[PDB]
Amino acid sequence: LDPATLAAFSAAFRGELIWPSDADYDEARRIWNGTIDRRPALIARCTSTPDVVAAVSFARKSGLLVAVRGGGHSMAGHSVCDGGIVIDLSLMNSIKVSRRLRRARAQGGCLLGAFDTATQAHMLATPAGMVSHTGLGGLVLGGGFGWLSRKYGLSIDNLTSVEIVTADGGVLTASDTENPDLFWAVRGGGGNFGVVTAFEFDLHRVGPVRFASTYYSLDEGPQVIRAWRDHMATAPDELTWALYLRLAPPLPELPADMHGKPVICAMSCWIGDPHEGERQLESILHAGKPHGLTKATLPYRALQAYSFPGAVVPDRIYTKSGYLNELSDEATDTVLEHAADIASPFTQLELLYLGGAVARVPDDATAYPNRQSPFVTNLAAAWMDPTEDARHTAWAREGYRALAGHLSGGYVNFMNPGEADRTREAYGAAKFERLQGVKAKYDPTNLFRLNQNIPP
Ligand SMILES: Cc1cc2nc3c(=O)[nH]c(=O)nc-3n(C[C@H](O)[C@H](O)[C@H](O)COP(=O)(O)OP(=O)(O)OC[C@H]3O[C@@H](n4cnc5c(N)ncnc54)[C@H](O)[C@@H]3O)c2cc1C
């Protein structure tokens, strides 16, 4: 490490440096995917945009492999690197909300729960992921979907501008009117094009939400999933209905003879009038007998903080996901045969219906692929014992291969560390090559390669 560069970076960087000798280094480098044990040479905790600029320039000059960390939830483990530098944005957590203009400006290191807390102070909101502590950074740059998406689209579908630090250390504002090629690419292209230090979103009024969660016996699985698939094909935007095949959590609402056994966990909500929501959710809650039924009228920030029942954070995860255009009866059976073999109490086989507002955005308006594929299956193995990695990974892998005949594309934010190759297939040829032209203009060095990578 050349000293003049380091020393001038020390004079510009008004944040915290964590070195491999420091006590807090083992914790600071930990990311949510515990199977990713990497030793960065240097962890930089930025507090403002000039901090990131200094961190970007110093990494460019010094030749260090760049990681960027928002909330650290990368299923591929991109946010920590072996022997490089970590531009850590976790301290840049602030949000300014205009209730009157319905505008939220959030720093690149925000967590979802912080963002939704600030907007819900004015009963405002904009779509994002379902787990409170995942980061706004990586989620939004990949698309971002959740409870508000069928009504209001992806997270990017409400983005209006970004402040971004490009590989050359320059700071650019990208929007629909300013650097619009870059705005297209960051809306689905990940961290490939620079470090976003500020997002601006349009917001929506979201009052109380009538919500429901329940569990169905697996030997009623066929009629439940079929009812689910059949209903969502024509369901109104306001109804979001998700299925999570999993081992029943040992919760008092469920009978003890169901604890630990595979079930279907159905979570449903109605974005709109709670009285219309109660009528709507009752029309979908009885495809089979609902066990452990919880129905509530929750403020939207409570809905955001609910997932997942049991409130356990796993240490180790491996995920295989893809989209479906159709969910045949044979595919439904296949899902059920593999869900019955679930081993860890923290593993889920997620089945989501997007569509709605997501699919009414034209294919080419952003960089997010597969808007016209409604279904998402996410085989999400999650466990604690690091000596058991092979048996839980094998469940995701072998379940994915049995469904390969229905699966196409892939959400970049659900990719596991060994899926660097799925990139061209996930984006498609037209989107991949346009992304490469933005990557050629803004990061021709591929300084930012710790992501679902798009080489220039
Ligand atoms: C428990 C859990 C639940 C999830 N639920 C959902 C969900 O409901 N819906 C959904 O759509 N996705 C979901 N995700 C996935 C989430 O969208 C991605 O994992 C996302 O990448 C997480 O971002 P992060 O910032 O926390 O991750 P990190 O690991 O920090 O980073 C992810 C990627 O984005 C880059 N990045 C992060 N911040 C920035 C920034 N400011 N500028 C540039 N690049 C940046 C990193 O370089 C990295 O390549 C979930 C993930 C987890 C772990």
Query: CATH code at 344?
Result: 3.40.462.20
Same domain for 385 and 424, yes or no, is no
Same domain for 264 and 401, yes or no, is yes
26: CA distance to ligand 1 center in Å?
21
75: CA distance to ligand 1 center in Å?
8
CB distance 61 to 442 below 8 Å = no
Same domain for 189 and 230, yes or no, is no
CA distance 396 to 412: 17
Q: Which amino acid does the sequence have at 205?
A: R
195: CA distance to ligand 1 center in Å?
13
The response to whether residue 71 sits with its C-beta less than 6 Å from ligand 1 reads: yes
* Residue in 139, 316, 378, 411 to alter for ligand 1 test, most ligand atoms within 8 A of Cβ: 139
Minimum-distance ligand 1 atom for the alpha carbon of 194: 43
CB distance 221 to 176 below 8 Å = no
The response to whether residue 79 sits with its C-beta less than 6 Å from ligand 1 reads: yes
Same domain for 199 and 223, yes or no, is no
Say how far residue 398 (Cα) sits from the centre of its chain: 23
CA distance 348 to 355: 22
Q: What is the CATH number of the domain that holds 41?
A: 3.30.43.10
CB distance 349 to 377 below 8 Å = yes
186 located within any domain: yes
The response to whether residue 272 sits with its C-beta less than 6 Å from ligand 1 reads: no
- Name the residue with the closest Cα to ligand 1, atom 47: 68
For β-strands 66-69 and 209-217, DSSP reports them as unpaired
Same domain for 268 and 385, yes or no, is yes
CB distance 174 to 194 below 8 Å = no
CA distance 201 to 99: 12
Number of structural domains in the chain: 3
CB burial of residue 208 (10 Å; 0-12, 13-18, 19+):
middle
Same domain for 120 and 159, yes or no, is yes
Same domain for 282 and 159, yes or no, is no
Same domain for 221 and 107, yes or no, is no
233 located within any domain: yes
**Sign, Cα dihedral of 32, 243, 248, 129:** positive
Domain that holds residue 221: 206-415
Residue 325 — φ and ψ, nearest 5°? -85, -30
Instruction: Name 116's Cβ contacts closer than 8 Å, sequence gap at least 6.
Output: 125, 128, 132, 300, 301, 304
- In angstroms, this model's resolution equals 2.2
In DSSP terms, 79 is beta-bridged to none
456 located within any domain: no
67: CA distance to ligand 1 center in Å?
13
* SS3 category, 205: strand
CA distance 227 to 187: 33
CA distance 258 to 250: 8
Q: How many residues can be counted in the chain? A: 456
- Technique that determined the structure: X-ray
279: CA distance to ligand 1 center in Å?
35
Same domain for 235 and 179, yes or no, is no
